Design a protein around this motif. Structure first.
Motif, PDB file in Angstrom:
ATOM      1  N   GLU A   1      -8.750  -6.120   6.719  1.00 52.87           N
ATOM      2  CA  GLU A   1      -8.867  -6.557   8.104  1.00 52.87           C
ATOM      3  C   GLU A   1     -10.242  -6.141   8.604  1.00 52.87           C
ATOM      4  OE1 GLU A   1      -7.193  -4.344  11.726  1.00 52.87           O
ATOM      5  OE2 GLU A   1      -5.852  -6.081  11.775  1.00 52.87           O
TER       6      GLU A   1
ATOM      7  N   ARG B   1     -10.688  -2.216   7.526  1.00 59.93           N
ATOM      8  CA  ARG B   1      -9.463  -1.459   7.289  1.00 59.93           C
ATOM      9  C   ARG B   1      -8.745  -2.055   6.085  1.00 59.93           C
ATOM     10  NH1 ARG B   1      -9.792  -0.956  13.022  1.00 59.93           N
ATOM     11  NH2 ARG B   1      -8.074  -2.196  13.941  1.00 59.93           N
TER      12      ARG B   1
ATOM     13  N   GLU C   1      11.083  12.718  -2.835  1.00 62.01           N
ATOM     14  CA  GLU C   1       9.932  12.032  -3.390  1.00 62.01           C
ATOM     15  C   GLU C   1       8.962  11.710  -2.267  1.00 62.01           C
ATOM     16  OE1 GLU C   1      10.735   8.525  -5.447  1.00 62.01           O
ATOM     17  OE2 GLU C   1       8.836   8.606  -6.575  1.00 62.01           O
ATOM     18  N   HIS C   2       7.695  12.066  -2.478  1.00 64.45           N
ATOM     19  CA  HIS C   2       6.629  11.835  -1.512  1.00 64.45           C
ATOM     20  C   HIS C   2       6.040  10.443  -1.687  1.00 64.45           C
ATOM     21  CE1 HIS C   2       6.370  15.641   0.489  1.00 64.45           C
ATOM     22  NE2 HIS C   2       6.287  16.300  -0.654  1.00 64.45           N
ATOM     23  N   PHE C   3       6.030   9.679  -0.608  1.00 64.14           N
ATOM     24  CA  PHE C   3       5.322   8.417  -0.533  1.00 64.14           C
ATOM     25  C   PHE C   3       4.254   8.516   0.544  1.00 64.14           C
ATOM     26  CE2 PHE C   3       9.481   7.013  -2.171  1.00 64.14           C
ATOM     27  CZ  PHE C   3       9.042   6.356  -3.306  1.00 64.14           C
ATOM     28  N   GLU C   4       3.073   7.972   0.274  1.00 58.16           N
ATOM     29  CA  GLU C   4       2.039   7.886   1.297  1.00 58.16           C
ATOM     30  C   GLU C   4       1.637   6.431   1.554  1.00 58.16           C
ATOM     31  OE1 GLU C   4      -1.287  10.093  -0.131  1.00 58.16           O
ATOM     32  OE2 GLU C   4      -2.010   8.447  -1.416  1.00 58.16           O
ATOM     33  N   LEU C   5       0.866   6.248   2.629  1.00 59.66           N
ATOM     34  CA  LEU C   5       0.246   4.964   2.967  1.00 59.66           C
ATOM     35  C   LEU C   5      -1.160   5.252   3.491  1.00 59.66           C
ATOM     36  CD1 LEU C   5       0.208   1.982   3.233  1.00 59.66           C
ATOM     37  CD2 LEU C   5       1.463   2.118   5.363  1.00 59.66           C
ATOM     38  N   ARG C   6      -2.162   5.132   2.610  1.00 56.59           N
ATOM     39  CA  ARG C   6      -3.562   5.262   3.002  1.00 56.59           C
ATOM     40  C   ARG C   6      -4.029   3.999   3.723  1.00 56.59           C
ATOM     41  NH1 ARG C   6      -5.250   9.462  -0.488  1.00 56.59           N
ATOM     42  NH2 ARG C   6      -6.636   9.860   1.317  1.00 56.59           N
TER      43      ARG C   6
ATOM     44  N   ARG D   1      -0.448   8.196   6.244  1.00 56.27           N
ATOM     45  CA  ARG D   1       0.890   8.214   6.831  1.00 56.27           C
ATOM     46  C   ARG D   1       1.897   8.366   5.689  1.00 56.27           C
ATOM     47  NH1 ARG D   1       1.011   4.745  10.572  1.00 56.27           N
ATOM     48  NH2 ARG D   1       2.464   5.244  12.300  1.00 56.27           N
ATOM     49  N   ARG D   2       2.372   9.589   5.486  1.00 53.62           N
ATOM     50  CA  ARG D   2       3.297   9.880   4.405  1.00 53.62           C
ATOM     51  C   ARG D   2       4.748   9.716   4.852  1.00 53.62           C
ATOM     52  NH1 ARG D   2      -1.067  13.401   3.385  1.00 53.62           N
ATOM     53  NH2 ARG D   2      -1.907  13.109   1.256  1.00 53.62           N
ATOM     54  N   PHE D   3       5.617   9.561   3.858  1.00 54.22           N
ATOM     55  CA  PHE D   3       7.061   9.528   4.043  1.00 54.22           C
ATOM     56  C   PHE D   3       7.685  10.405   2.969  1.00 54.22           C
ATOM     57  CE2 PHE D   3       4.934   5.552   4.851  1.00 54.22           C
ATOM     58  CZ  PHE D   3       5.183   5.356   6.203  1.00 54.22           C
ATOM     59  N   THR D   4       8.610  11.266   3.382  1.00 52.08           N
ATOM     60  CA  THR D   4       9.269  12.181   2.467  1.00 52.08           C
ATOM     61  C   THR D   4      10.762  11.925   2.554  1.00 52.08           C
ATOM     62  OG1 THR D   4       7.530  13.870   2.457  1.00 52.08           O
ATOM     63  CG2 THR D   4       9.771  14.571   1.974  1.00 52.08           C
ATOM     64  N   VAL D   5      11.376  11.651   1.409  1.00 49.46           N
ATOM     65  CA  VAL D   5      12.721  11.101   1.346  1.00 49.46           C
ATOM     66  C   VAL D   5      13.543  11.907   0.351  1.00 49.46           C
ATOM     67  CG1 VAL D   5      12.073   8.783   2.040  1.00 49.46           C
ATOM     68  CG2 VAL D   5      11.865   9.459  -0.335  1.00 49.46           C
TER      69      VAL D   5
ATOM     70  N   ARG E   1       2.486   4.006  -1.872  1.00 47.84           N
ATOM     71  CA  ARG E   1       2.348   4.554  -3.212  1.00 47.84           C
ATOM     72  C   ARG E   1       2.897   5.978  -3.236  1.00 47.84           C
ATOM     73  NH1 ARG E   1      -1.885   4.919  -6.904  1.00 47.84           N
ATOM     74  NH2 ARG E   1      -3.319   3.555  -5.718  1.00 47.84           N
ATOM     75  N   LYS E   2       3.519   6.353  -4.358  1.00 48.94           N
ATOM     76  CA  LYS E   2       3.952   7.732  -4.559  1.00 48.94           C
ATOM     77  C   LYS E   2       2.769   8.679  -4.420  1.00 48.94           C
ATOM     78  CE  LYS E   2       6.173   8.613  -8.262  1.00 48.94           C
ATOM     79  NZ  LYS E   2       7.317   9.466  -7.866  1.00 48.94           N
ATOM     80  N   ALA E   3       2.848   9.578  -3.446  1.00 52.35           N
ATOM     81  CA  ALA E   3       1.784  10.546  -3.224  1.00 52.35           C
ATOM     82  C   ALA E   3       1.956  11.758  -4.129  1.00 52.35           C
ATOM     83  CB  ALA E   3       1.759  11.002  -1.768  1.00 52.35           C
TER      84      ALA E   3
ATOM     85  N   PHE F   1      -5.311  -0.950   2.883  1.00 52.88           N
ATOM     86  CA  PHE F   1      -4.573  -0.001   2.050  1.00 52.88           C
ATOM     87  C   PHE F   1      -5.184   0.141   0.667  1.00 52.88           C
ATOM     88  CE2 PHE F   1      -0.832  -1.848   4.576  1.00 52.88           C
ATOM     89  CZ  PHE F   1      -1.129  -1.049   5.660  1.00 52.88           C
TER      90      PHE F   1
ATOM     91  N   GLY G   1      -5.623  -7.901   1.529  1.00 53.49           N
ATOM     92  CA  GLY G   1      -5.211  -6.686   2.216  1.00 53.49           C
ATOM     93  C   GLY G   1      -6.257  -6.011   3.083  1.00 53.49           C
TER      94      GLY G   1
ATOM     95  N   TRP H   1      -1.175  -6.922   1.444  1.00 51.21           N
ATOM     96  CA  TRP H   1      -1.702  -7.209   2.774  1.00 51.21           C
ATOM     97  C   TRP H   1      -1.737  -5.943   3.621  1.00 51.21           C
ATOM     98  CZ3 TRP H   1       2.415  -5.809   5.767  1.00 51.21           C
ATOM     99  CH2 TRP H   1       3.717  -6.210   5.422  1.00 51.21           C
ATOM    100  N   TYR H   2      -2.872  -5.675   4.253  1.00 48.75           N
ATOM    101  CA  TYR H   2      -2.903  -4.693   5.324  1.00 48.75           C
ATOM    102  C   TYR H   2      -2.037  -5.172   6.488  1.00 48.75           C
ATOM    103  CZ  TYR H   2      -4.534  -2.074   9.329  1.00 48.75           C
ATOM    104  OH  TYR H   2      -4.585  -1.333  10.491  1.00 48.75           O
TER     105      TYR H   2
ATOM    106  N   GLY I   1       0.773  -1.228   0.000  1.00 49.14           N
ATOM    107  CA  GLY I   1       0.000   0.000   0.000  1.00 49.14           C
ATOM    108  C   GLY I   1       0.806   1.280   0.000  1.00 49.14           C
TER     109      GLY I   1
END
Ligand SMILES: [Mg+2]
Ligand SMILES: [Mg+2]
Ligand SMILES: [Mg+2]
Ligand SMILES: [Mg+2]
Ligand SMILES: [Mg+2]
Ligand SMILES: [Mg+2]
Ligand SMILES: [Mg+2]
Ligand SMILES: [Mg+2]
Ligand SMILES: [Mg+2]
Ligand SMILES: [Mg+2]
Ligand SMILES: [Mg+2]
Ligand SMILES: [Mg+2]
Ligand SMILES: [Mg+2]
Ligand SMILES: [Mg+2]
Ligand SMILES: [Mg+2]
Ligand SMILES: [Mg+2]
Ligand SMILES: [Mg+2]
Ligand SMILES: [Mg+2]
Ligand SMILES: [Mg+2]
Ligand SMILES: [Mg+2]
Ligand SMILES: [Mg+2]
Ligand SMILES: [Mg+2]
Ligand SMILES: [Mg+2]
Ligand SMILES: [Mg+2]
Ligand SMILES: [Mg+2]
Ligand SMILES: [Mg+2]
Ligand SMILES: [Mg+2]
Ligand SMILES: [Mg+2]
Ligand SMILES: [Mg+2]
Ligand SMILES: [Mg+2]
Ligand SMILES: [Mg+2]
Ligand SMILES: [Mg+2]
Ligand SMILES: [Mg+2]
Ligand SMILES: [Mg+2]
Ligand SMILES: [Mg+2]
Ligand SMILES: [Mg+2]
Ligand SMILES: [Mg+2]
Ligand SMILES: [Mg+2]
Ligand SMILES: [Mg+2]
Ligand SMILES: [Mg+2]
Ligand SMILES: [Mg+2]
Ligand SMILES: [Mg+2]
Ligand SMILES: [Mg+2]
Ligand SMILES: [Mg+2]
Ligand SMILES: [Mg+2]
Ligand SMILES: [Mg+2]
Ligand SMILES: [Mg+2]
Ligand SMILES: [Mg+2]
Ligand SMILES: [Mg+2]
Ligand SMILES: [Mg+2]
Ligand SMILES: [Mg+2]
Ligand SMILES: [Mg+2]
Ligand SMILES: [Mg+2]
Ligand SMILES: [Mg+2]
Ligand SMILES: [Mg+2]
Ligand SMILES: [Mg+2]
Ligand SMILES: [Mg+2]
Ligand SMILES: [Mg+2]
Ligand SMILES: [Mg+2]
Ligand SMILES: [Zn+2]
Lengths: 60, 18, 155, 23, 97, 97, 206, 127, 83
Positions: free
Chosen positions: E92, E6, E58-63, E42-46, A56-58, E8, E90, G21-22, A54
Motif C-alpha cells: 500500500e 506499507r 503458539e506465537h503468531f506475529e503480523l509485521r 502485532r502478535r497473537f498468542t494462542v 507468520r509463526k513468530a 506484510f 500486498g 494482500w496488506y 502476513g
RNA sequence: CAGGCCUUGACAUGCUAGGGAACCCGGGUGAAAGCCUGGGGUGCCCCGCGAGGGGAGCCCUAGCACAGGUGCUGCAUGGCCGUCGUCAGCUCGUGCCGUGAGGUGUUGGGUUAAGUCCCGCAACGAGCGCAACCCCCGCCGUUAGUUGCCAGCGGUUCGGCCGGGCACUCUAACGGGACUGCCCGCGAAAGCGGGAGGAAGGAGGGGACGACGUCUGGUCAGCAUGGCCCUUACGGCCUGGGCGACACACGUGCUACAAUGCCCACUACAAAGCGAUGCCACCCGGCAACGGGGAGCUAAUCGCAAAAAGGUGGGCCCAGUUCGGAUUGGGGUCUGCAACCCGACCCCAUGAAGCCGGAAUCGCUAGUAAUCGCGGAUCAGCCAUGCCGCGGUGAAUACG
C-alpha cells in the motif's frame, strides 16, 4: 444452544453493552480476536494454512 | 430425565431441563 | 553437577579497594540485586570500622575472614543404618563462601539497628576472634574433631 | 506498601493516581 | 513529494521502494533513498490446543513493515511514468508532498 | 485433610465416609498421610478408584478398577498399602554391609 | 499428538501465503471474511474440478482469485460457460471486481491435497484403506517426488477400534525447513463417521 | 584531535568522544560524576584508561541512550576502550588481557510461555 | 455508586405504576422485576412484590429504606448454614 | 434456575396456497418478550391515453418438508493439544542366524548435547528422529537518511530550535563472520585439554522445531463427525436470578510481617507495545477519582509516558509501629440501559491477622534466581494479584 446465538450475536441489541464478539468461522463466544473476527483456535487453523495474510509463526 | 449432567436415572439423561 | 566440575565464577574487583573478595562479600550483603545499597553498606561499614578502630578496614575485613574460614567440617554420609557425620577438609573456595556467608548471617543477627554498623561490628569481632560468625567456625570445627573417629570414611 | 492504596507505592501498583500519587 | 510504503512482506516492500526510487531516479532528478521505518509487530498468542493445556501456546506475529522514499526534485516527467507503475499485491502506497 | 472427588458421577456423604473408613487402614503404618486425595469415576465396565497421597517417605499413587465400586475402593486400598509398606521398609533392606 | 502443521511451519520460507494482500487494522477481518466466503463457494463448487490451491490477491476493492486444478476445463465451463457463471455469483458476494483465473496443475500427483482428496473419496467408495494408501504413495513416487507419506486415521474399514494407517516411501524431513514439503488434508465422510487423510509430498529442498 | 568508540551494553548504547583534555568527562550534557552520583559501580566506566595511564590526558564528551545507569556504565567502559584503540592500536595489550575490548552479549533472557519468567517455572503440587 | 451528575434511577415503568397508586389512592400490590430500581420517597409506605429469580417478595417500604435499591430487600440466595 | 411467552421456529433449502411486495412511523397491554392494533407508496416485460391482468426481484400468514439441540457416547471418530521428552531413540530393505517368537544391523571399544562422529563387526544400506537449513540477540560492512540521529560550522527565542550534514546513535533489509580453520599436546581415528587471534570458540545466548509410539491421555462445550436421544420441546425469546452461595478442605497466586525497611519532597536511566465515537498533549475546576474545555497524531512526527527499584534530602527509631493494609462506616467518581445481589477507582474514618510459618514441598545454574517497574491481547467497564511479553538493577552455589 448455538445457532440461535450465532444469529443473536449478529443483531443490533436493545442496548449497546450486549454487543459481543463471536467467531465468524466457528461461532465461539470466547477468546475472540477483534483483528481477525476469529477465535484463537480458528486463528491458529487459518494461520497454519497461510490464509491469514502476513500472519507468520513468530520466534524470537 | 433430560439434559446433560448429572444424570437423572434415565439412560444418557441428566437433570437439566430446557 | 554430573558432567564436569563447575567453573568458579570470577568477580571483577570492587572499585574502592580493588579486592576480588570485597566484591564477593558485597554480593553476600545484596538482597534483590540492590548492589548499590550493598556496596553502600560494606563501605559505610569500613567508614565505621575505621572510626572505632584506627586500622585500615581492608586489613580488618580480610583478618575477620581468616578467622571465620573453617578448616574442617562434618558432612553426613549414611553408612549402613546410620548417617555418620564425616570430618572432611574444606576447600578454600568453600571456606571463603562459608566465612562470607556466616559473617553477613551472624552480622544480621546482631542487635544494632543499622546494617552497615552490624557488618562493621561483626567484622571487628571476627577480626579479633569474637562474634557469632567465629562461633560458627568453631562449632563446625569441634564437630569435625569430635568425629575424627570417622575420618577413614572420608572420600 | 503495595497493598496500601494510600501511598504512592500502592498507587503505582494499582496503577491509579490521586492525592497520594498525583499527576 | 513523499512516498510511504506499507506491507506484510518486506521482500516486496523493499522490492517496490526500489522500483519507485528507480522511476524518479530515471525521470529526474533527485530522490532520497528508501528509508526503512521501524516495524509494527502485532502478535497473537494462542493456547496451542482446543481444550485445556493452558501452559502450551503458539506465537503468531503480523509485521507491517514501513518504507519511506522521497522524490526530491519532483519533475512531472516522473509523475506521469509513476502514474503507471507496478506495485505487487500486498503493498500500500501513501503519496503526499 | 482428606479430599474425595466424585468425577462425572454423584456419590453421597455415606460413600464419602466409607472411603475415609477404608482409607483409614493406611493409618496402621503410623505415618503422616498428607492431603490424601481419592478420586472416584465410572468407566463403561467398572468404577475406578484413584488415590494420590504423599507421606514423609514418598508419594502413594494407585488406581483400582472393578465392576463393584466398593471392591474397586478396596483394590485401591490394597495397592496403596503395598506401596506404603514398601516406603516404610525399603530403607531397612540395605542395612548390611 | 504433537507434529506442527508443515505449511504453517514454512510460510515465508518454502511456501507462501495462499492469500497475499496488506490491509489495515480497520479492514483486515472484513477482507479475510471474503477470502473465507470466497473459498466457500469455490471449494464447494470447483471440488469436482480438482481444487488444489486457491490464491486471493487484493489491491483496491478488486480481488484476483487464482485457482490451480487438475481439471481446468471443469471450472472454465462449456467454452467459457461456467467460469462466467462463477464470476457472477462471485462478484455477487464480492460485490466488486471479482477477477477470476485458472491455473494448470502440472502434475496433480505432486500436489498433496489432490492425492489426499483422492484417497478420501477412494475410501468413501469403500476401497481397502491400506492398499489405497500404499498406492497413493506409489503414484506420487512414479511422478518423481523425492518422498511421500500418506496417513489415514479413523474407523478404517468401519472397525470399531479407530486406527491410524500410513505408508511413506523416500524422504519426508519435516524438521527441515528448506525441504519443500507439500502437505494437504481431506476429510472422508463415511456411513460410520469421518476419517482423516493427510498427504505429504517431498518435492525437493532449496 | 578527537577519538570515538561505540559502546553498547544491555539496551544501553553509548557514544564516547575521547578528546585530549585535563580529565573532564561529560555524560549526556552533564558531568559524569553528577550523572552517576551515588553509583559506586561508576569508576568502572572510566577504567580502560587507568590500564593505559590515560587518566587525565583526555576528556570525554559522552552521550548515552538506552538501558539503565550501570548498563550505560558498561557501555561507556567499552566505548572509551574502543576509542583508545583507534587512538593507538598498540593498546590492545593492556586492554584485551584486561578484556576491555570485548563486549558481553548478556541480554535479558526472553520470557517463555508456561513459566513465570524466563526460566522460573510455576509451582505445582505433584501430590 | 452511580454518578451524582446522572439522575437517580427508577425504572420509569415501575414508577408509572406507583404514581397512579398515589393519585387514585393506593394500595394495590405491585409485582415488579425491577431490582435495579432505587427506592424513591414517592414509594414510601407502599408494598412492592420484588422478584428475586424465584418469587415476588413483598417489601413494605419505609422512610429508613428509601436510599436503597429494591433488590437489597428481596434476597436471592437461599441459605440456612451448614450442618 | 424461576417466571411470562413463541411453534416452520433466532437460522437453511424448499414446494403450494391469501396478501402485498420490498420498507419506514407508531399506538394499546406488558417487566421485557410477546400479543393485539393503527399509518401509508413495488419497480420491469406487459393490453396499459382504460378499469383491470400478472410473473417475479422481497414482505407476512396458514401448511407440509425440514430446521434447531453447548442434549448422551472423546469407550464409535476427524482435527488439534497434553505427556513421557529435545529424551536418543524408533524402524525398514535386502543378506545372515534361529523350527519358531525373534535376532543381527541398532551390539561392541572410543567420542559426543545426540543412533554425534571414529574404529571394529554377517553384515551392507536406507528412512523417520539428532543436527542443519528458519527467527531473535552479540560484532562488523554494504544499502538507506525521515518522522530518527547531532560529530564539526553558522546562527539559537535558549527547545537539534533553525540552517546544515548522515558522521554517530538508530531504524530495517542484505551480506560478512566461527569452521575445532591455525599452534601446542594427547589420539589409530573421531575427538579431548590448553593457546593465539577475535565481538564471539568448541552447538556463542535464547527461540521455533517434538521420531515410531505410550497414556482405551485430553477435547462430541471451539469446529467437524458416526450412532443415540428431544420435537408447542431436551428447540427458541425475554425479564429476573445463578455461574460471585460458605460450618469446611486442597491447588495456584498477591501482599505482608519491616530499618538492606517504611513515608514525604525533589532528581535520574529502559524496552516492547498500543492508539480516528482511539491515545490525549496543555489550561482550568475539584484533596482526589474525575469533569470541563481543548491542541496534536491516520502516527520513528502527536499521545498513552511517569518507568519503578535507583539517586539526593528530610522524617520515623524497633514499637503489631509512620510496619501490614485486611475489614467496616461515611462520602464521592466513571463506565454502562442498569453496578441489590455483583464493577473498578478516589477521599475521609476504621486500621484485622500477621514478629518469618508443622508435617511436608516448589523454582532456579547467569544477565539466571531474586527484586523493580512498563506494555498487550480479551475488553464499555472490571473483579488481572491471571496470562503473554518487555526491559531495569542483578547475585549465591555445583565437592560430587
Ligand atoms: Mg453446532
Ligand atoms: Mg461486554
Ligand atoms: Mg467475545
Ligand atoms: Mg433453554
Ligand atoms: Mg546469605
Ligand atoms: Mg551462622
Ligand atoms: Mg569466641
Ligand atoms: Mg501503610
Ligand atoms: Mg499458568
Ligand atoms: Mg473432598
Ligand atoms: Mg461433579
Ligand atoms: Mg457427589
Ligand atoms: Mg455408556
Ligand atoms: Mg457398566
Ligand atoms: Mg489415573
Ligand atoms: Mg488386606
Ligand atoms: Mg512391593
Ligand atoms: Mg537492536
Ligand atoms: Mg560520586
Ligand atoms: Mg527480567
Ligand atoms: Mg498443572
Ligand atoms: Mg481418546
Ligand atoms: Mg471425559
Ligand atoms: Mg484422539
Ligand atoms: Mg532383516
Ligand atoms: Mg534357538
Ligand atoms: Mg530361515
Ligand atoms: Mg526380523
Ligand atoms: Mg535400538
Ligand atoms: Mg533391535
Ligand atoms: Mg558405542
Ligand atoms: Mg540432545
Ligand atoms: Mg543415526
Ligand atoms: Mg555397526
Ligand atoms: Mg551510510
Ligand atoms: Mg573445548
Ligand atoms: Mg532440530
Ligand atoms: Mg478415556
Ligand atoms: Mg460437537
Ligand atoms: Mg456427535
Ligand atoms: Mg442406522
Ligand atoms: Mg435469558
Ligand atoms: Mg466460575
Ligand atoms: Mg471437610
Ligand atoms: Mg493471585
Ligand atoms: Mg510473592
Ligand atoms: Mg486497551
Ligand atoms: Mg519488630
Ligand atoms: Mg494495631
Ligand atoms: Mg496480633
Ligand atoms: Mg500502623
Ligand atoms: Mg461503603
Ligand atoms: Mg455489579
Ligand atoms: Mg521476608
Ligand atoms: Mg522464608
Ligand atoms: Mg523439611
Ligand atoms: Mg518488595
Ligand atoms: Mg503487568
Ligand atoms: Mg483492558
Ligand atoms: Zn473460531
Amino acid at each position: 444452544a448455538r445457532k440461535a446465538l450465532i444469529e443473536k450475536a449478529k443483531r443490533t441489541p436493545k442496548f449497546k453493552v450486549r454487543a459481543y464478539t463471536r467467531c465468524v468461522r466457528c461461532g465461539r463466544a470466547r477468546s475472540v480476536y477483534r483483528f481477525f473476527g476469529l477465535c484463537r483456535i480458528c486463528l491458529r487453523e487459518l494461520a497454519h494454512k497461510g490464509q491469514l495474510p502476513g500472519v507468520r509463526k513468530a520466534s524470537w | 430425565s433430560k439434559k446433560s449432567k448429572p444424570g437423572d436415572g434415565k439412560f444418557g439423561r441428566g437433570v437439566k431441563r430446557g | 553437577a554430573r558432567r564436569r566440575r563447575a567453573e568458579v565464577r570470577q568477580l571483577q574487583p570492587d572499585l574502592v579497594y580493588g579486592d576480588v573478595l570485597v566484591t564477593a562479600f558485597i554480593n553476600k550483603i545484596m538482597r534483590d540485586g540492590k548492589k548499590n545499597l550493598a556496596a553502600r553498606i560494606f563501605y559505610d561499614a569500613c567508614k565505621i570500622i575505621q572510626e572505632k578502630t584506627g586500622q585500615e578496614p581492608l586489613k580488618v575485613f580480610k583478618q575477620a575472614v581468616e578467622n571465620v574460614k573453617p578448616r574442617m567440617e562434618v558432612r553426613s554420609r549414611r553408612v549402613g543404618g546410620a548417617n555418620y557425620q564425616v570430618p572432611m577438609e574444606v576447600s578454600p573456595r568453600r571456606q571463603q563462601s562459608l566465612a562470607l556467608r556466616w559473617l553477613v548471617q551472624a552480622a544480621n543477627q546482631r542487635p544494632e539497628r543499622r546494617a552497615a554498623v552490624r557488618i562493621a561490628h561483626e567484622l571487628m569481632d571476627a577480626a579479633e576472634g569474637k562474634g557469632g560468625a567465629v562461633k560458627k567456625k568453631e562449632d563446625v570445627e569441634r564437630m569435625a574433631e569430635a568425629n575424627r573417629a570417622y575420618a577413614h570414611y572420608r572420600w | 506498601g503495595k497493598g496500601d492504596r494510600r501511598t504512592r507505592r500502592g498507587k503505582i501498583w494499582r496503577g491509579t493516581y490521586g492525592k497520594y500519587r498525583p499527576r | 513529494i513523499r512516498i510511504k510504503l506499507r506491507g506484510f512482506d518486506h521482500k516486496t516492500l523493499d522490492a517496490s521502494a526500489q522500483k519507485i526510487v528507480e522511476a524518479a531516479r530515471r525521470s529526474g532528478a533527485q530522490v532520497s533513498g528508501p528509508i526503512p521505518l521501524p516495524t509494527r509487530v502485532r502478535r497473537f498468542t494462542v493456547i496451542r490446543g482446543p481444550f485445556k493445556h493452558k501452559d502450551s501456546r503458539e506465537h503468531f506475529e503480523l509485521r507491517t513493515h514501513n518504507r519511506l522514499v522521497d522524490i526530491i526534485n519532483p519533475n512531472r516527467k516522473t509523475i506521469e511514468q509513476l502514474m503507471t507503475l507496478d506495485l505487487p499485491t500486498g503493498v500500500e502506497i501513501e503519496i503526499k508532498t | 485433610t482428606m479430599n474425595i472427588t466424585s468425577k462425572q458421577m454423584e456419590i453421597t456423604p455415606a460413600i464419602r465416609q466409607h472411603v475415609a473408613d477404608r482409607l483409614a487402614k493406611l493409618e496402621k503404618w503410623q505415618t503422616h498421610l498428607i492431603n490424601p486425595h481419592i478420586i472416584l469415576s465410572k468407566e463403561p465396565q467398572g468404577f475406578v478408584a484413584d488415590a494420590t497421597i504423599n507421606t514423609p517417605n514418598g508419594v502413594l499413587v494407585a488406581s483400582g478398577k472393578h465392576e463393584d465400586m466398593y471392591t474397586a475402593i478396596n483394590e485401591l486400598i490394597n495397592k496403596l498399602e503395598r506401596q506404603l509398606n514398601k516406603l516404610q521398609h525399603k530403607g531397612e533392606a540395605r542395612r548390611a554391609a | 499428538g504433537n507434529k506442527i502443521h508443515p505449511i504453517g511451519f514454512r510460510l515465508g520460507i518454502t511456501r507462501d501465503w495462499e492469500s497475499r494482500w496488506y490491509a489495515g487494522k480497520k479492514q483486515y477481518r472484513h477482507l479475510l471474511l471474503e477470502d473465507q466466503r470466497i473459498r466457500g463457494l469455490l471449494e464447494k463448487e470447483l471440488y469436482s474440478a480438482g481444487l488444489a490451491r486457491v490464491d486471493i490477491e487484493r489491491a483496491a476493492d478488486n480481488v484476483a482469485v487464482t485457482v490451480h486444478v487438475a481439471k481446468p476445463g471443469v471450472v472454465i465451463g462449456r467454452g467459457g460457460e461456467r467460469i462466467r457463471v462463477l464470476r457472477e455469483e462471485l462478484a455477487k458476494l464480492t460485490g466488486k471486481n471479482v477477477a477470476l483465473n485458472v491455473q494448470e496443475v502440472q502434475n496433480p500427483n505432486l500436489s498433496a491435497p489432490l492425492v489426499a482428496q483422492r484417497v478420501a473419496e477412494q475410501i468413501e467408495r469403500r476401497f481397502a484403506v491400506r492398499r489405497a494408501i500404499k498406492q497413493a504413495v506409489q503414484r506420487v513416487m512414479e511422478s518423481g517426488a523425492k518422498g511421500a507419506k500418506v496417513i489415514v486415521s479413523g474407523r478404517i474399514g468401519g472397525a470399531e477400534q479407530a486406527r491410524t494407517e500410513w505408508a511413506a516411501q523416500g524422504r519426508v524431513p519435516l524438521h527441515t525447513l528448506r525441504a519443500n514439503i507439500d502437505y494437504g488434508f481431506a476429510l472422508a465422510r463415511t456411513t460410520y463417521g469421518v476419517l482423516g487423510v493427510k498427504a505429504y509430498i517431498f518435492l525437493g529442498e532449496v | 584531535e578527537q577519538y570515538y568508540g561505540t559502546g553498547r551494553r544491555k539496551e544501553a548504547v553509548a557514544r564516547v568522544f575521547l578528546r585530549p583534555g585535563n580529565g573532564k568527562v561529560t555524560v549526556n550534557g552533564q558531568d559524569f560524576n553528577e550523572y552517576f552520583q551515588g553509583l559506586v559501580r561508576a569508576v568502572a566506566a572510566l577504567e580502560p584508561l587507568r590500564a593505559v595511564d590515560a587518566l587525565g590526558h583526555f576528556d570525554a564528551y559522552i552521550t548515552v541512550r538506552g538501558g539503565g545507569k550501570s548498563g550505560q556504565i558498561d557501555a561507556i567502559k567499552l566505548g572509551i576502550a574502543r576509542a583508545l584503540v583507534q587512538y593507538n592500536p598498540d593498546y590492545r595489550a593492556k586492554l584485551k588481557p584486561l578484556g576491555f575490548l570485548t563486549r558481553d552479549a548478556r541480554v535479558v533472557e526472553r520470557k517463555k510461555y508456561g513459566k513465570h519468567k524466563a526460566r522460573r517455572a510455576p509451582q505445582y503440587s505433584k501430590r | 455508586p452511580r454518578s451524582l451528575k446522572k439522575g437517580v434511577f427508577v425504572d420509569d415503568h415501575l414508577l408509572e405504576k406507583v404514581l397512579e397508586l398515589n393519585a387514585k389512592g393506593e394500595k394495590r400490590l405491585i409485582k415488579t422485576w425491577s431490582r435495579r430500581s432505587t427506592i424513591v420517597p414517592e414509594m414510601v409506605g407502599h408494598t412492592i412484590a420484588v422478584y428475586n429469580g424465584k418469587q415476588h417478595v413483598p417489601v413494605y417500604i419505609t422512610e429508613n429504606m428509601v436510599g436503597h435499591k429494591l433488590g437489597e430487600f428481596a434476597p436471592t440466595r437461599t441459605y440456612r448454614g451448614h450442618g
